[PDB]
Amino acid sequence: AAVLKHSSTLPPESTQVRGYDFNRGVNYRALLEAFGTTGFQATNFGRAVQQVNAMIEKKLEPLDQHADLTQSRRPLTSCTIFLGYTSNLISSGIRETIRYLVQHNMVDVLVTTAGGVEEDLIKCLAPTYLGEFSLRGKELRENGINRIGNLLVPNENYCKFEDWLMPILDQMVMEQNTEGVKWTPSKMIARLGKEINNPESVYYWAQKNHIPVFSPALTDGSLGDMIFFHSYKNPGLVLDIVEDLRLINTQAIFAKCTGMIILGGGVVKHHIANANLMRNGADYAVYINTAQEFDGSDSGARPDEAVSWGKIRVDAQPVKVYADASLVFPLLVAETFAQKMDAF
Amino acid sequence: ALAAVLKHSSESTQVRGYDFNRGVNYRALLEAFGTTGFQATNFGRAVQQVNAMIEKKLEPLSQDEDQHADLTQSRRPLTSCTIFLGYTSNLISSGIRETIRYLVQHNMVDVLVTTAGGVEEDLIKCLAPTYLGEFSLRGKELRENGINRIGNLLVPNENYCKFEDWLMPILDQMVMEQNTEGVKWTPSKMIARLGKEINNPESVYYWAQKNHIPVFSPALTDGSLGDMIFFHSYKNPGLVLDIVEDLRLINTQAIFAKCTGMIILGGGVVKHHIANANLMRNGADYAVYINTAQEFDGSDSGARPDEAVSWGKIRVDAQPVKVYADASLVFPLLVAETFAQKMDAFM
Amino acid sequence: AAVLKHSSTLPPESTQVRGYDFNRGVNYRALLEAFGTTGFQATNFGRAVQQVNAMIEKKLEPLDQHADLTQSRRPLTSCTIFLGYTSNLISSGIRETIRYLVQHNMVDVLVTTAGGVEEDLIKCLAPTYLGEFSLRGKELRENGINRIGNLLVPNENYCKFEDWLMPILDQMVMEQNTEGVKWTPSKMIARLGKEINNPESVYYWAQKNHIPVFSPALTDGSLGDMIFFHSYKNPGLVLDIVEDLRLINTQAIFAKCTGMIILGGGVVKHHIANANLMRNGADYAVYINTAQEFDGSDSGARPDEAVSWGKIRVDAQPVKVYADASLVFPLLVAETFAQKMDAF
Amino acid sequence: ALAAVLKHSSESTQVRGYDFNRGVNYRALLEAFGTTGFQATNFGRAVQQVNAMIEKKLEPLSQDEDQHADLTQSRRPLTSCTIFLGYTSNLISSGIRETIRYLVQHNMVDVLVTTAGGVEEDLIKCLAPTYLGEFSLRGKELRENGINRIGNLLVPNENYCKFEDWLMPILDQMVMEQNTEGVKWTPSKMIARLGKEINNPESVYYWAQKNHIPVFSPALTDGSLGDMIFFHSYKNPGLVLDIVEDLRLINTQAIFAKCTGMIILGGGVVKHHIANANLMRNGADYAVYINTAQEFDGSDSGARPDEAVSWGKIRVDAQPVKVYADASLVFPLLVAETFAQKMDAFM
Numbered sequence A, C: 001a002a003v004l005k006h007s008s009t010l011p012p013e014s015t016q017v018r019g020y021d022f023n024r025g026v027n028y029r030a031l032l033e034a035f036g037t038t039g040f041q042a043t044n045f046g047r048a049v050q051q052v053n054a055m056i057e058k059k060l061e062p063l064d065q066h067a068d069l070t071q072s073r074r075p076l077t078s079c080t081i082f083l084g085y086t087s088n089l090i091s092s093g094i095r096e097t098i099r100y101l102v103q104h105n106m107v108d109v110l111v112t113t114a115g116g117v118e119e120d121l122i123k124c125l126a127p128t129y130l131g132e133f134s135l136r137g138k139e140l141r142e143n144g145i146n147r148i149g150n151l152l153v154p155n156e157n158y159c160k161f162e163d164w165l166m167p168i169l170d171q172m173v174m175e176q177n178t179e180g181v182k183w184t185p186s187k188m189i190a191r192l193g194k195e196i197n198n199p200e201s202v203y204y205w206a207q208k209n210h211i212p213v214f215s216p217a218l219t220d221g222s223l224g225d226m227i228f229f230h231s232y233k234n235p236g237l238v239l240d241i242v243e244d245l246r247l248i249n250t251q252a253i254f255a256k257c258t259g260m261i262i263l264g265g266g267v268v269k270h271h272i273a274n275a276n277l278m279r280n281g282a283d284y285a286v287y288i289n290t291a292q293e294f295d296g297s298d299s300g301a302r303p304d305e306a307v308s309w310g311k312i313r314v315d316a317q318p319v320k321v322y323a324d325a326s327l328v329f330p331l332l333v334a335e336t337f338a339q340k341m342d343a344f
Numbered sequence B, D: 001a002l003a004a005v006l007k008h009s010s011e012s013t014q015v016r017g018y019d020f021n022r023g024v025n026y027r028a029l030l031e032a033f034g035t036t037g038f039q040a041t042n043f044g045r046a047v048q049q050v051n052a053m054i055e056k057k058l059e060p061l062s063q064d065e066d067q068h069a070d071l072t073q074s075r076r077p078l079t080s081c082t083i084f085l086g087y088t089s090n091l092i093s094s095g096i097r098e099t100i101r102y103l104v105q106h107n108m109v110d111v112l113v114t115t116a117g118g119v120e121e122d123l124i125k126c127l128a129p130t131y132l133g134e135f136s137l138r139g140k141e142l143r144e145n146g147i148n149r150i151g152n153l154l155v156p157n158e159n160y161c162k163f164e165d166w167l168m169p170i171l172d173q174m175v176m177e178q179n180t181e182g183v184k185w186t187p188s189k190m191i192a193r194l195g196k197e198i199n200n201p202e203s204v205y206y207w208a209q210k211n212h213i214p215v216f217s218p219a220l221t222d223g224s225l226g227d228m229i230f231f232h233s234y235k236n237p238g239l240v241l242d243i244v245e246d247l248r249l250i251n252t253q254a255i256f257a258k259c260t261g262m263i264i265l266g267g268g269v270v271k272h273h274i275a276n277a278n279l280m281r282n283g284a285d286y287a288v289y290i291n292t293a294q295e296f297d298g299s300d301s302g303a304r305p306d307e308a309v310s311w312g313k314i315r316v317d318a319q320p321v322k323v324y325a326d327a328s329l330v331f332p333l334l335v336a337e338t339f340a341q342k343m344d345a346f347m
Ligand SMILES: O=C(Nc1cccc2[nH]ccc12)c1cc2ccc(Br)cc2s1
Pocket: A084, A085, A086, A111, A112, A113, A245, A248, A249, A252, A262, A263, A264, A265, A266, A267, A268, A272, D221, D222, D223, D226
């Protein structure tokens, strides 16, 4: 008191901390709304809801398409939304959440990691089960079960996938060799989505709605195993990543405005957003992941790192929620996209 | 081909997330966490464990249980499950203070344990508010403006000055009562007195004292309360706070519990062997931890519940759960699906 | 290039990234020196070495003692160093590192958490063993073994401690009741250190060198179990925390200069450093821990949080190394205290 | 009293740290990590596993092993243990680039796998340096100054411009060779060509191509290399990079290895079943991960090695180790105690 500085009155729009009062009973909407003033990551959740709603409102504003350069059947809107997620999230029930968004045309580009395609298709053939993180590899191997976090996928699921996939790969090679088709990951993912023909599949809806999927490390997962084994029976498949780079970059540079929602990981480090002459950098970004920055990893980098790359604009107000997206993403969707369903 | 190199597989639950084509049915959405995987599934497991704990607590005491239950000397009648609620001080600076207060107000837990700061921040909030900031705010600028940072929260210096003004006359009475009325102070007794003084239904500690829920915090002096006790001791020396009597009081609760449950937020459990001395039921039958700490450095805060099983603090036959998440997100959701659904049974 | 800003030439004291070159062979001192320019937490390690060396050099500068108010047998020096650590570190081999520092009078005040006293004393009676994090509580219980991270402590170790401790507790109660002794945690820890009479013990050396130990939550660990069981045989022990608060605070407010080294956890949140009229706040601080800030925990708070409390000075350059102190602390000591041994 | 309530206990190593009363004997200090506990003990275990891997690699191939070893079509003669070294791109921006380069220079590993950025940052460092900064540096100010942030490292925009100037004529030759000499490019072949072009002994990829160590990075286009390939394709269209042939090349290495070891820095392993198709020895016999990622979100990067055992990628009988630490601290120490001690055996 004799030793502490007098406090400079805080701004008049300064928000007081207050949690939800259960003496009101349980109104879940009011409970989720109270996260904003609860503090720590609950506050970041509230900030994320605000950012995603701003992104959606921008997208819904009514509108040159550059269709010659984009080579795309999907018309530009007032905000191009990129949805990114790691493959573990597709093994989880967040697959249902992502599918919903894609089914209703709520996002414009999907980006994922190795495994992130096939686990969606495999779930159309056979289920993934709940287990525990602590289950020992020895016991699981003796029982022909693969672990993904606390999830369990029987070996047979991958055997069923192989059987389903092989005649599709045969057609792809035949179409390449005799019909001039130049395959890329995104074109392959669209074909698999068409083939699975199942409304529970993310990739079925993506292709139906002309939402492209980019995954240049497609071969790092089970799909790689299959392509490789297939090549011994029917050699010659080629997958080019350069044309996919051109397709996604033309989306990036001709977007009127850009928003990103990134789950489980971080963003790529590159300068292409600076070549968007209309609006360089994203106006909106939300990350939801548990990774930490201190090892220098891409996954753990804060959004403000991407501002130095030009990937997110200096004047954007990006938000990271430090949490497992399996918990947070359905809540975020409940308060954003699922409210605006009528507009989509 | 894979069938040639992979082994065939030999009450199992399928993974499935909430389908928003059903609309936003919030209870169904929360219920779908259990089958969503990763920490969402641990949330579902926690809901189940807390509800089991609640159902146990609400069971009538049989005649024999009632006898051995009644072997504490305390005010608070014993129930079929003694619930310990533990939390780090940062959560009292957060809005989770309201959630904790609700539980205490309705006698839904039996013992509170917290860390340095965890008492005074509740009391100070009855005198002046805490505000939202950001984690990245620089110490230099905050210092210039007379503002203290707690995570992404902000507490003005003036809050601690108002607290000092409020507290000094109470410390004066406590010393006078110690020296003329034979009062032997301990942290728990001080915490009860401060709750009674604040006399405000938004205060966790007001309700704890009103409902005879003891609060234990032997490192009481490591926070702002320490600062004030210290300065007070200049003009009014000799206040004694005995931690041994508080140890006796908490261990007596632990030892004579018919059954024990723990809900621990923000940190981990203490390492000791006292639960092995409960004659009726050694170790906790239920336990939920909610925190983001990791085990790999050997820290208490990051230890899995199964560590405490080796100490006897949690029973081998219990099914404890840790949700690896910030309790500011998870705890209100947990309460919504557990205690808040059974509020009438506690009224 | 057409889209990227020209780079503003960096400061002339800007340091280039370069790792150790093993084509030189293996000089471990040069290897540790190269951490500074390696990046990420290796760079923070280098910064920590610099900060600890600055703290030591300050302490070693030749010098009013305020002995009336401090009530202390230890003379003030040009820098009071506080060493803080969580109890798990005393179960680890970092016990040997801490003991070395205390034995050679290299620090002035020890602060620890529940368990942090007794595990040092118990190791003088019986050993702790290596195990694994994944060992199941059921199996350990069946074999009478307690787990601490990947360390294992037999139940018998605690039984031996009980037998050793009981007659000391008897003496403490007798001294309280008939010789006017007013016990506090710090006085108790000094007595136990004297009693263990073993040069492997941290607390033996602390008492021998008049380095006080503060642990107001002393009763949260095994020592609490013992005090409690003892009270059934010999009631009446009182441990006051207020007098310990006065002792440590008088150290804090009369220090000429303050440095802190904090292992495994964060600092306490209070304003007492502002009452040091000579030099308010610490001039030097190093934290070594793996905790993350995003939940708002004290353990995970960056040093810059404590600057807002006045606990660390605005003009200090504190460092956090995001790492397990079991790896980093011996390396830090090798490059700092262990180099200046001749000066102590 | 405790003896009354606690059970008695039934090649075990005692905990003991390095004693600095012995002076600063650095090798003895490093050796004491094994008995220090927590991650220090995991470091000791990693040293042991990497040394076992090295001793295996240096074993002569028997006559039978030599036959089945020789079933790849590759330049690089097969050895008794094929070591895969994996690392995230951030580590190439760090000083660990020098450590990796040393291993590659001396043929101490057999296959390199990295992420987007992990190729170009090595090449760019031969044209211009990376500098130390801080994690907290604000994007706004860095943008104003034309500086890119990678953790606490700083790379000026001008570095990427110099890289573009250097790279464009090489991309011109690659397209010309593709269209007139029948070259079928893949990421690994491009990486080999870029190493040969840079022609600088500080470059990881210079040494990899010189020593016939293939590099695999199917997401090559997710970094700055992508930016440049993209712009190049305006005036010189049609470059194809086939990821299927690279898949074939890496799987052939994996399938015909006599024995496999992995050292993975910064991230986790891929999830697939290809190791189950190695006829001689399915799964890795040795594996060390060094990263700070946590498993609880189900992420690849945070998975324990024992997850990969369920996929067949690591053998049930292996004793894999994860050190939970920033590889910038740990990897040079690991190399000091393993590969660097056996350098003569690799020369
Ligand atoms: O931003 C990305 N990709 C690109 C956007 C725009 C133009 C691009 N060109 C080349 C790449 C690329 C990202 C891809 C992924 C993948 C998984 C996860 Br989780 C996050 C992200 S963020």
